[PDB]
Amino acid sequence: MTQPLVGKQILIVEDEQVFRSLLDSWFSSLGATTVLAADGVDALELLGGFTPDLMICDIAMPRMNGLKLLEHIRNRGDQTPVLVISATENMADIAKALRLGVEDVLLKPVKDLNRLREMVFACLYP
Amino acid sequence: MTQPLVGKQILIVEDEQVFRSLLDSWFSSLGATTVLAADGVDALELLGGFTPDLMICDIAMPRMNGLKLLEHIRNRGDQTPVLVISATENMADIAKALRLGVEDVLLKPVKDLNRLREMVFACLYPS
């Protein structure tokens, strides 16, 4: 199959339009249905009414650091799988993400589209 | 001002990746914060918990014709401004969109990005 993610809903939270388009383009290519949010506060609001199969965010977020997004939904009882894609070198931040429950924390810029591919597959078909 | 839509939340419902990306690019360029949905059923679900300043959709939608999206939110009592962008030539479909309450129905493909610009401005800053 060239579209193995058909039937999967992916929430992408990404403030850079180009990276946002690449991620939409890639996941859509694979058959996923995407929701994209430019802003992490807007994503928090969306998650009130909607439950995706996977959420992709950055923990180093300009408007509102995505750790707080993660913390707020995890306090509610949301078990939504989260994959972090981040350039952060800050080990206290990564450790806080891991304690809140993320599938993984992948380095940005993505220097292996091969790896993300099987990381996304590890999340969506465990 | 080169970013006149700062503080405006726009929901874009668009099944074509490239057009989706163009609209994201354009609205983001003008300072709006965007939410994009590939799929109209997912947009119906999102609107349960979220109220944008403007929704952009096509009435001629593959998965689920966007008239039903429009009819379902309008039966709830949502006053969310909607702008339809569509190549539809079907006068009955346009007329149903207009009865449901739509800011306007703009012809696709978009000749002219000047027009969409002030159409979007009429929706987001009326009077």
Author numbering:
A (entry chain B): 1 to 126
B (entry chain A): 1 to 127
Passage from the reporting paper:
Overall, the structure consists of five repetitive (αβ)-elements which form a parallel β-sheet (β2–β1–β3–β4–β5–) sandwiched by two helices (α1 and α5) on one side and three helices (α2–α4) on the opposite side. Similar to several REC domains, our structure of RssBN formed a dimer in the asymmetric unit. However, in contrast to many RRs the RssBN dimer showed an anti-parallel orientation, which is mainly stabilized by β-strand augmentation via the terminal β2-strands. This orientation is different to the biologically active dimer of several RRs including PhoP from E. coli. Superposition of RssBN onto the RssB/IraD structure revealed an r.m.s.d. of 1.4 Å. While the core structure of this domain is well preserved (with the exception of small deviations around Asp58), there were clear changes in the conformation of the α5 helix across the structures. From analysis of the B-factors of RssBN (which resemble molecular flexibility) it became obvious that the last helix (α5), in particular, shows higher mobility. This is supported by the observation of limited hydrophobic contacts between this helix and the core domain structure. Significantly, Arg117 is located on the mobile α5 helix of RssBN, which is directly linked to the C-terminal domain that makes direct contact to σs. Based on our mutational analysis of conserved residues located within the N-domain, we propose that phosphorylation of RssB (at Asp58) is sensed by the conserved residue (Lys108) located within the 4-5-5 interface.
